[PDB]
Amino acid sequence: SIFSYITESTGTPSNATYTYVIERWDPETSGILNPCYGWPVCYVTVNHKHTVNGTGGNPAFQIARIEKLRTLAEVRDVVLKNRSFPIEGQTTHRGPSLNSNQECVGLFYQPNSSGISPRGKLLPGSLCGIAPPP
Ligand SMILES: N[C@@H](CCC(=O)O)C(=O)O
Ligand SMILES: [Zn+2]
């Protein structure tokens, strides 16, 4: 799984600044495929749930192009090579009202590198608000 959690949500449900931690991404040993393999363009990003359905907002930043990577394990290899973990920082949400159970910052896949991301979703196995085991 991919473990991330928000440690502070400053503001209101519809206008918030999140402080977050993406703490750990466990090895990918079950053969899960990259859900955006074969798209013309796909990014893995740090992004947040923007709607009640969990679709992506404006990403904090993009980590890598991944549309040529067939498996989720290959995506993990590229993310862990290019970013030291834990990934920590802030991002912002302005849009639909989200309660704490609807807030989440994590690793999204998406075709766009900036702007609201209706086709962006958390990568498979993303856990929001749950700490990893020691
Ligand atoms: N930077 C955008 C954030 C949009 C979002 O919630 O993804 C704004 O403040 O309008
Ligand atoms: Zn948002």
Numbering used by the authors: 25 to 158
The authors write:
The structure of MrpH153 was solved to 1.02 Å resolution using single anomalous dispersion, and the structure of the longer MrpH159 construct solved to 1.75 Å by molecular replacement using MrpH153 as the search model. The two structures are very similar, with an r.m.s.d. of 0.45 Å between 129 Cα atoms. In both MrpH153 and MrpH159, a metal bound by three histidine (His 72, His 74, His 117) side chains was found. Similar electron density, consistent with the binding of a carboxyl group ligand, was present also in the MrpH159 difference electron density map. No tartrate was included in MrpH159 storage buffer or crystallization conditions, and tartrate did not fit the density. We therefore concluded that an unknown ligand, possibly a (di)carboxylic acid, had been picked up by MrpH159 during protein expression. Since our TSA experiments showed stabilization of MrpH159 by glutamic acid (increasing the Tm by 7.9°C), but not by glutamine, aspartic acid, or asparagine, we decided to test if glutamic acid could explain the difference electron density. In addition to the carboxyl group interactions with the protein, which are the same as for tartrate, there is also a water-mediated hydrogen bond interaction with the side chain of Asn 82, and a salt bridge from the Glu main chain carboxylate to the guanidinium group of Arg 118. The ligand-binding site together with the crevice extending from the ligand-binding site across the positively charged top surface of MrpHntd might allow MrpH to accommodate an extended ligand or receptor with a carboxyl group for binding to the Zn2+ in the metal binding site. It is interesting to note that MrpHntd was thermally more stable in the presence of glutamate, but not aspartate, glutamine, or asparagine, indicating some level of specific binding to the glutamic acid side chain.
MrpH resides at the tip of mannose-resistant Proteus-like (MR/P) fimbriae and is required for MR/P-dependent adherence to surfaces. Although MR/P belongs to a well-known class of adhesive fimbriae encoded by the chaperone-usher pathway, we found that MrpH has a dramatically different structure compared with other tip-located adhesins in this family.
